[model samples]
Target: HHHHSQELLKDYIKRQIEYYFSVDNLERDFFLRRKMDADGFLPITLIASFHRVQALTTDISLIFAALKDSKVVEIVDEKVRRREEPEKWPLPP
Candidate 1:
């Protein structure tokens, strides 16, 4: 029970964070964009509050731990952001 549940939860957290930071979503999610700090980071707490993320786990530390393996997003000072700025990501044709 513990093994698969842990892995599945981690994958869910990673996917949610990655999707939020994806270029396409970032470009169009005005509310999310406005929520970003001047440095383009959002508090992990904010992500954890989202319906999908909250469904997985309300624990912010768990979400942070899961993101350790993520390639698309980075965590800093309890905040998260895309590894590369939206402008730096290749545009989708």
Candidate 2:
């Protein structure tokens, strides 16, 4: 209604956009963001580091954790299972 005023509408839009731009909002709307932030800042950094440029890597231990958590694990596992033997995706098998 006109009673709300143009200023109120503008304020509402600004607030909504800012809310959606925040880390909490992004994490809530996107599962990946949530998973990465599950353990806080360090964990998210770990997620990006895993399988990334080797020179920029951090938290190698966290890398292992992320690997186990990502969808790529399923593909690698299935690939190894299909193999005869001794060639079961050596890097991560």
TM-score of 1: 0.84
- Name the top TM-score candidate: 1
Q: Residue 25 of model 2: what lDDT?
A: 47
Q: Least lDDT summed over 10 consecutive residues: which range in candidate 2? A: 77-86
Model 2 shows how many backbone clashes? 0
| Candidate 2 to native Cα RMSD, angstroms | 17.8
Output the lDDT of residue 41, model 1: 77
- Backbone clashes for every candidate come to 0, 0
lDDT of 1 by residue, 1-93 (tens): 457887788888889878988887877777777777766778899988988999989887789888997889888888887888633433322
- Against the reference, the lDDT scores of all candidates come to 0.80, 0.32
Instruction: Please name the candidate that would achieve the greatest lDDT relative to the true structure.
Output: 1
